[PDB]
Design a binder for this molecule. Structure first.
Ligand SMILES: Cc1cn([C@H]2C[C@H](OP(=O)(O)O)[C@@H](COP(=O)(O)O)O2)c(=O)[nH]c1=O
Ligand SMILES: [Ca+2]
Length: 137
């Protein structure tokens, strides 16, 4: 149902933003749907706590994968900054979920109709909270 396709890593930027080579054949910046990892680049809030950890996690995950796939939700495919909005998978593992599960991101920016995996992400977030991991420590 959801549109999914292969992509190739260009570079990991931070915990929730990565540059990939789309099936299109064009280099694009992707921002992970439904999550927010702590900031590491913008002068507002600074280098938030867990930022570097979130960044390291994502980098590790995409750099070690055999296969990267991008899955678009049902509504808009790009944000106002021109970033592609998707669920990213590394060897069939959802990075968006992986981060939440570890308490390295919170569920955020839920913009209907792009919320197909919201409940899934929410459950993982509840578990991380319950286990008092990283952000929830
Ligand atoms: C995740 C996501 C973020 N965004 C926008 C909202 C925020 O804009 P503003 O910058 O105007 O606040 C910003 C959050 O991204 P970052 O966490 O990368 O900064 O990107 C969307 O528009 N749609 C989305 O699905
Ligand atoms: Ca962020």
């Amino acid at each position: 149902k959801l549109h999914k396709e292969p992509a190739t890593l260009i570079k990991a930027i931070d915990g929730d933003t990565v540059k990939l080579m789309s099936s299109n054949g064009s280099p694009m910046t992707f921002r992970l749907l439904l999550v927010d990892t702590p900031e590491t680049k913008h002068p507002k809030k600074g280098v938030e706590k867990y930022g570097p950890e979130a960044s390291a996690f994502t980098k590790k995950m995409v750099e070690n994968a055999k296969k990267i796939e991008v899955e678009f939700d049902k509504g808009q495919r790009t944000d106002k900054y021109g970033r592609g909005l998707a669920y990213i998978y590394a060897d069939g593992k959802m990075v968006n979920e992986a981060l939440v599960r570890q308490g390295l991101a919170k569920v955020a920016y839920v913009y209907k109709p792009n919320n197909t995996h919201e409940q899934h992400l929410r459950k993982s977030e509840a578990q991380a909270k319950k286990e008092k991991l990283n952000i929830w420590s």
